[PDB]
Design a binder for this molecule. Structure first.
Ligand code: NAP
Ligand code: FOL
Ligand code: MN
Ligand code: MN
Ligand code: MN
Length: 159
């Protein structure tokens, strides 16, 4: 089973200038809990943005060019990326925009954080047909001293 996990600001913005400009520790904690002990697939630009391997996960990087770091696994196609995960219950696709586009048609689950923040970005999460997806979990949080915007965690399952 393939799942996508992402945090979306207003208008489905996910990044600007190869970065995420907000800081929401509660959402990074949610990301860690939902990805630990699972393989994670990311594109090369996201790998450069994170800047190190994510511990406790098998890190698989998509790139058309040879890998430059043997602490992670490098693959050259979507099918190779999936194969490199092995026989696991759930594969997590962690972006970015181009990678989410390719994996959305193959995904059964979306873990989305909706952040109440306006930022002028250059990368968007794919348009997803709402009728295809059922909301199975949602949890709203107001802003607090650690998290400067309100946010909503949602899990959607393909109908
Ligand atoms: N808010 C969030 O949840 C979130 C999550 C992840 C990322 N982001 C943000 O998203 C942005 C990066 O997204 P992006 O769309 O620019 O890049 P991306 O999807 O991370 O990476 C694209 C790169 O991945 C490789 N790639 C993708 N598909 C491939 C395929 N089928 N075969 C081979 N290689 C393939 C290519 O690398 P080569 O050029 O080497 O071939 C391509 O240039 C950053 O701003 C980041 O901060 C946000
Ligand atoms: N909901 C969500 N939030 C995100 O920030 C996010 N980020 C990415 C890609 N970028 C990043 C950037 C940093 C870290 C990171 O530092 N993670 C640590 C944090 C642990 C914690 O804060 O408790 C990790 O071990 O996962 C992960 C992904 C993909 N999907 C996401 N999905
Ligand atoms: Mn092929
Ligand atoms: Mn198999
Ligand atoms: Mn806000």
């Amino acid at each position: 089973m393939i799942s996508l996990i992402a945090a979306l600001a207003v208008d489905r913005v996910i990044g600007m200038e190869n970065a995420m400009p907000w800081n929401l520790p509660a959402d990074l904690a949610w990301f860690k809990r939902n990805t630990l002990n699972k393989p994670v697939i990311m594109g090369r630009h996201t790998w450069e943005s994170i800047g190190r391997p994510l511990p406790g996960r098998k890190n698989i990087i998509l790139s058309s060019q040879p890998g430059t770091d043997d602490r992670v696994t490098w693959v050259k196609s979507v099918d190779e990326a999936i194969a490199a995960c092995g026989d696991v219950p759930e594969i997590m696709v962690i972006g970015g925009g181009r990678v989410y586009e390719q994996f959305l048609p193959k995904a059964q689950k979306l873990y989305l954080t909706h952040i109440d923040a306006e930022v002028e970005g250059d990368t968007h999460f794919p348009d997803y047909e709402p009728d295809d997806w059922e909301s199975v979990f949602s949890e709203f949080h107001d802003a607090d001293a650690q998290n400067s915007h309100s946010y909503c965690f949602e899990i959607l399952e393909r109908r």
